[PDB]
Design a protein around this ligand. Structure first.
Ligand SMILES: OC[C@H]1O[C@@H](O[C@H]2[C@H](O)[C@@H](O)[C@@H](O)O[C@@H]2CO)[C@H](O)[C@@H](O)[C@H]1O
Ligand SMILES: OC[C@H]1O[C@@H](O[C@H]2[C@H](O)[C@@H](O)[C@@H](O)O[C@@H]2CO)[C@H](O)[C@@H](O)[C@H]1O
Lengths: 134, 134
């Protein structure tokens, strides 16, 4: 099953740090911040091999009973199958601020202008090993 | 719904710190470490008013399809309705080590000799505000 933190509000001014390990033969895994598996304000997918996507980050939002919105992509990809990663996320009402394992950063709009989220989860071909949400 | 951290293994040598706030008119709330809502290796219930229990901690394990085992109790109760609390838990194969908001400690046996747990949750009349599991 997926790894999740539920109903511990991730609020404006708080920081989320997750650590994990990428599966050896991973296709892709995602880190998700939102309200449900069908309501995601910040989805960050890490694509080792997905169709034609290789070594790319793909970010988007998922709206309940509606679907995926406009994707954003980054070629920053400091991730290795079989290896640990760590990611830090903070946000204000306009922006999600993501910091990757190597210190590079990606930003993604806070499309709903949410000030808090009740669900953080990892899905796909990786596992989590630690979390700080505070 | 309950507040939980799921499928981020809480392993030997790691520490769990949760912060939260007790509901104003709370009867009781618990912090639980185990595998499911029916499989709990360390249940720590905080009883403000429960039957004849007032201002007491009650610790126990819950076995799946079996039920609650031998309760242990403590009168250490540095908790106030409406107020923040923080708790830190670590364990080895014999013992759960719990540290309360005021620095006092309670210990509870690791009855299964588990070296890792996939579920941490809070239930009842309180809410969580932060977590460090690392
Ligand atoms: O946008 C995030 C989601 O992408 C979906 O895949 C897209 C893909 O990125 C796009 O290039 C085209 O292939 O449409 C696909 C289907 O919407 C993932 O399938 C999805 O899980 C999210 O990662
Ligand atoms: O042992 C933890 C569980 O206690 C249950 O309550 C017990 C109670 O502590 C005991 O004094 C007697 O009243 O039996 C009750 C029922 O088993 C709680 O109901 C339960 O949720 C756990 O906290």
């Amino acid at each position: 099953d997926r790894a999740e933190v539920r109903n511990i509000p991730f609020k404006l001014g708080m920081s989320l740090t997750v650590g994990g390990v990428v599966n050896s033969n991973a296709t892709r895994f995602s880190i998700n911040v939102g309200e449900s598996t069908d309501s995601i304000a910040m989805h960050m997918d890490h694509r080792f091999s997905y169709g034609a996507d290789q070594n790319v980050l793909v970010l988007n939002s998922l709206v309940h009973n509606v679907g995926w919105q406009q994707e954003e992509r980054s070629k920053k990809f400091p991730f290795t199958k079989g290896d640990h990663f760590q990611t830090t996320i903070t946000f204000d009402t306009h922006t999600f601020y993501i910091q990757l394992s190597n210190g590079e950063t990606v930003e993604f709009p806070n499309r709903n202008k949410d000030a808090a989220f009740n669900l953080i989860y990892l899905a796909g071909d990786a596992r989590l090993t630690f979390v700080r949400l505070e």
